[PDB]
Amino acid sequence: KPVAHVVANPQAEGQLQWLNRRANALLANGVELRDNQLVVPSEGLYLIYSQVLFKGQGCHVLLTHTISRIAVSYQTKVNLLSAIKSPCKPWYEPIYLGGVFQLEKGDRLSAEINRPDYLDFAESGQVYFGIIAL
Amino acid sequence: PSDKPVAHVVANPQAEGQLQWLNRRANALLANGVELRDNQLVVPSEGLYLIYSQVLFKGQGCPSHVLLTHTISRIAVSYQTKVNLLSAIKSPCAKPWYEPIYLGGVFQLEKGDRLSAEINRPDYLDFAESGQVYFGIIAL
Amino acid sequence: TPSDKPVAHVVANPQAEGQLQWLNRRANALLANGVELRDNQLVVPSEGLYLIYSQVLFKGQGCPSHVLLTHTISRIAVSYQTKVNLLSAIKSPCKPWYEPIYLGGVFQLEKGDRLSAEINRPDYLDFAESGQVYFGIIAL
Ligand SMILES: Cc1ccc(C)c(Cn2c(CO)nc3ccccc32)c1
């Protein structure tokens, strides 16, 4: 069962960087984390999921979070799962993502935001990215 | 290859005043028995499933009262009834707002059950990028 | 060929107006593979990574003379038997309005941990329909 659950570095400047060797971070049976992307070890069905958390103090920003599939043969980047929030006293806006996908060996997976300056990396729990082979 | 019943379907962007689910699209699935019939997902065998859906609504400013809803429903063949499993009602409110509603949970389903994912306001749906509006299940 | 993963999805008792009573004994609610509902709390039967998730829904009529809506998920560990916040959210809803609050995340949990999911304003809770208010864990 290839699985992987990576979390964001709280020790990172203006960047969304996925760690595996953090507290509570599986990454088993061959799921590489290279170039900040999960590399799919074998072809099949996978549950792919994510969450990020934004915060700010008062307020025109749009916050986007997006998971993509970089195909191993084709080679371009396609949105798999994506959402947008409009945050307009401190505020907190998470974005949830997840679903099931047929993936190929070698495909890469991105989990990215557009405004890492509003990212809340204060602990863990709710800024994560992962895949689970079914 | 997994024998697990799964499905991931996506919204038709040029379905007018409708929330229409498609599988014949890149990165969309019906596998291991799941069917797409009359805009619904039919389950092929009993057991625990994860069920999930996202819609993303978008308006330009606010002149009101506007309400947005997103509802995943179950028709159990045995009971011949339609029941909500997951439902959110939200009040947004000339700048643009967005409201993404992600509904997920785990459920015990039966062979032949039918699953719907519906909203009140198809006109407020946004399709700027792909992957913004989807509906899926994953047998455990 | 069933899954042996600790899972649970519990729903608000729509009969208990003015309160938040989690029910696994209701249509489309469940406990499996050792998860218990005790004293309004979910009990974790084995250690591991778990997705915890919950939604509550608030509705009110007009906006009075000022209202803060909170939703909190807490953990009571065997090793440390007092409530620790895991997840938390607050909203000001200010003529009906609807304000759903969603919380979830992935956490390492121990055997016999007790999880709680609470609101401060049960009087604004809306469960005229199922699927609006729920709480659950799924073992990863
Ligand atoms: C309740 C739920 C049910 C089904 C699905 C697909 C998700 C998506 N999801 C999310 C969404 O932020 N985080 C996750 C962590 C682990 C597994 C799935 C996850 C959540």
Author numbering:
A (entry chain C): 11 to 69, 73 to 101, 112 to 157
B (entry chain B): 8 to 71, 73 to 101, 111 to 157
C (entry chain A): 7 to 71, 73 to 101, 112 to 157
What did the original publication write about this model?
We have discovered orally active small molecules that inhibit TNF activity both in vitro and in vivo. The compounds bind to a pocket in the centre of the TNF trimer formed by the movement of the TNF monomers, stabilising the distorted trimer, which leads to reduced signalling through TNFR1. Analytical size exclusion suggests that the asymmetric trimer only binds to two receptors, consistent with the structural data showing significant distortion at one receptor binding interface. We show here an approach to inhibiting TNF through allosteric binding using small, drug-like, orally available molecules that we believe stabilise a naturally occurring conformer of TNF.
After screening for compound-dependent crystallisation conditions, crystals diffracting to 2.5 Å were obtained for UCB-6876. The structure shows three TNF monomers in the asymmetric unit (ASU) and clear electron density for one molecule of UCB-6876 bound at the centre of the TNF trimer. The compound was buried within the space between the three TNF monomers and did not make any contact with solvent. The key interactions appeared to be the hydrogen bond from a benzimidazole N atom to Y151C (Y151 in chain C) and π stacking of the benzimidazole with Y59C. The 2,5-dimethylbenzyl moiety of UCB-6876 filled a hydrophobic pocket, assigned as Site 2, with compound TNF interactions composed of Y59A, Y119B and L57B. The asymmetry of the compound-bound TNF trimer results in minor distortion at two of the receptor-binding sites and a more significant change at the AC binding site (i.e., the receptor-binding site formed at the interface of the arbitrarily assigned A and C monomers in the crystal lattice). There is a clear opening of the AC site because of monomer A twisting and tilting down and away from monomer C. That UCB-6876 binds to a low abundance form of TNF is consistent with the slow on-rate observed by SPR, since the association rate constant is dependent on binding site access and concentration. As indicated by the crystal structure, once bound it is completely buried between the TNF monomers, explaining the slow dissociation rate.
